[PDB]
Amino acid sequence: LQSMAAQRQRALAIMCRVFVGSIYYELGEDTIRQAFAPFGPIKSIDMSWDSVTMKHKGFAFVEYEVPEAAQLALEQMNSVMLGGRNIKVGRPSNIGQAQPIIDQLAEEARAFNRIYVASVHQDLSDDDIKSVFEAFGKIKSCTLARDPTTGKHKGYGFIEYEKAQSSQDAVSSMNLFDLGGQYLRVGKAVTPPMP
């Protein structure tokens, strides 16, 4: 129960991290932050560092808050030209340690027609997002993630559609949709609303 919750949180910590390789030498942490922030709020960045060269070693780890952001970054940023080099975005070497929970979460997610939306402007609320996305079909829920303190939303959320066709169409259609001067990033959920 609470034990299952701890096991899931450990798996999720692993699942929220991506390896970013082939980082061009001109890039540093702020550029990596801006390149990977569209997919979800970044919880931390760990740049590689050489103490003798005083420079990074071409790679970094980006840590998100939900695994959908890491999945989306893997999908959308692998082989993107950052600076003068196409980057590699991959799983962390310990991703296998999220088994079996990683698969269990996906199987639970298959029961729902749920999508993940990031780069949601801080001035929008859940009903604003619902209105835009119900173009693709009836929505059962549209929830922006909120910080307990302040109650402000974190720039991302999840939408559950009644029909799989609708969630598929939203994911196929809405990437880079301009909402409030931010360009939405949209992907499938890999976790259920509730396990």
Do residues 108 and 90 share a domain?
yes
Do residues 104 and 133 share a domain?
no
Instruction: Please say which residue of 62, 94, 112 terminates a domain.
Output: 112
Tokens of 33: 């932050």
Neighbouring C-beta atoms of residue 1, cutoff 10 Å? 5
Residues whose CB falls within 8 Å of the CB of residue 143, separated by 6 or more in sequence, listed in order? 126, 157, 158, 159
Neighbouring C-beta atoms of residue 105, cutoff 10 Å? 21
Do residues 105 and 161 share a domain?
no
Do residues 161 and 78 share a domain?
no
Do residues 52 and 82 share a domain?
yes
- Cis link prior to 148 (omega < 30° from 0)? no
Q: What distance in Å separates the CA atoms of residue 31 and residue 23, rounded to the nearest whole number?
A: 10
Do residues 32 and 58 share a domain?
yes
Phi-psi map region of 32: left, alpha, beta (phi>0 left; psi -120 to 50 alpha): alpha
Query: For the chain, how many structural domains are there in total?
Result: 2
Do residues 63 and 89 share a domain?
yes
Tokens of 100: 């079996």
Instruction: Please say which residue of 80, 112, 144 terminates a domain.
Output: 112
Tokens of 6: 């701890």
Task: Yes or no: say if 36 and 77 are a contact pair by the CB < 8 Å rule.
Answer: yes
Q: What distance in Å separates the CA atoms of residue 93 and residue 137, rounded to the nearest whole number?
A: 39
Q: What distance in Å separates the CA atoms of residue 66 and residue 187, rounded to the nearest whole number?
A: 12
Q: Give resolution in angstroms.
A: 1.6
Do residues 82 and 129 share a domain?
no
The string of DSSP letters for the chain reads -HHHHHHHHHHHHHHTEEEEE---TT--HHHHHHHHGGGS-EEEEEE--BTTTTB--S-EEEEESSHHHHHHHHHHHTT-EETTEE-EEE--TTGGGGTTHHHHHHHHHTTSEEEEEE---TT--HHHHHHHHGGGS-EEEEEEEE-TTTT-EEEEEEEEESSHHHHHHHHHH-TT-EETTEE-EEEE-SS-S--
Long-range contacts of 133-137 (CB under 8 A, 24+ apart): 133/159, 133/170, 133/174, 136/161, 136/166, 136/167, 136/169, 136/170, 136/173, 137/161, 137/162, 137/163, 137/165, 137/166, 137/167, 137/169, 137/170
Tokens of 22: 């082939």
Do residues 141 and 179 share a domain?
yes
Instruction: Please say which residue of 82, 112, 142 terminates a domain.
Output: 112
Domain that holds residue 133: 113-195
Do residues 55 and 93 share a domain?
yes
Do residues 60 and 99 share a domain?
yes
Instruction: State which approach was used to obtain the coordinates.
Output: X-ray
Do residues 100 and 134 share a domain?
no
